Design a protein around this ligand. Structure first.
Ligand SMILES: [Ca+2]
Length: 259
């Protein structure tokens, strides 16, 4: 596989959200052998600044679950946003639910409907009142709620409401995310593979969340983390389940496969 695609949190990153020296060295060893790396996250691009400064290699960066792609120079290749009418509705769909907080990534800004490491980028929220947020430039809307079971009926209602026009995915149990239809880490990986002169068949992917499901099944080879959500394991039982990110399972798997 000429292209290695990996999710960050819960996948390549340690349980303490760090890139280990072992993992950094693995990226260098495979880069020296002509292997390409693509990192895919639900995070905003500003929120992966410290990670990209510590990778040690030049790589394509998929952020906001495939709504954005940047090259190694920080140049935004594409921005695939939510349709204006859908973004406008998502801003207010659960305004009056005290259990849910509505979050929005609009371009380089983070908005929140109401109030819910030292070398990390400054990335804060602004508050928005009904109607005071522009529904253009929306990479994603995400609903945060401590009660996972309370988010499940909201996932169903939005899928039934918009169908193909949205991609609804959980990241954590407490974060239900909405991107434009046709936008996912998998669809962005396919686009990036083509930029590199390859196809999905040339890709091996690693992930642990529902926002990795398309990426793991579309890639030539998909690996599910041992620490992954059970719903991901249940949806794709045909995929290999590897070790935990606590063991640095991804770089160890790569060294065993390539070196
Ligand atoms: Ca993850």
């Amino acid at each position: 596989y000429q292209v290695v695609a990996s999710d960050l949190d819960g996948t390549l990153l340690s349980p303490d959200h760090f890139l280990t020296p072992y993992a950094k060295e693995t990226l260098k060893l495979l880069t020296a052998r002509g292997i390409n790396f693509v990192f895919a996250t639900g995070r905003h691009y500003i929120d992966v600044g410290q990670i990209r400064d510590n990778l040690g290699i030049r790589s394509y960066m998929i952020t906001s679950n495939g709504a954005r792609v940047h090259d190694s120079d920080g140049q935004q290749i594409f921005a695939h946003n939510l349709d204006r009418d859908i973004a406008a509705d998502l801003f207010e769909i659960v305004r009056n639910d005290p259990k849910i907080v509505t979050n929005v990534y609009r371009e380089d800004e983070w908005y929140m409907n109401r109030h819910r490491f030292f070398k990390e980028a400054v990335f804060n929220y602004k508050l928005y009142e009904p109607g005071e947020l522009d529904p253009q430039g929306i990479s994603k809307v995400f609903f945060t709620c401590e009660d996972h079971e309370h988010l499940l009926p909201l996932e169903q209602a939005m899928n039934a409401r918009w169908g193909d026009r949205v991609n609804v995915s959980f990241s954590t149990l407490t974060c239900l995310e909405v991107m434009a239809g046709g936008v996912s880490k998998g669809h962005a990986l396919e686009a990036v593979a083509k930029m590199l002169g390859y196809t999905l068949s040339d890709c091996i992917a690693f992930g642990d969340g529902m926002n990795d499901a398309e990426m793991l099944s579309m890639a030539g080879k998909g690996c599910i983390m041992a620490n992954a959500h059970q719903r991901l394991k249940d949806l794709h039982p045909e995929l290999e389940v590897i070790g935990s990110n606590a063991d640095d399972a991804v770089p160890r798997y790569l060294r065993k496969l390539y070196l």
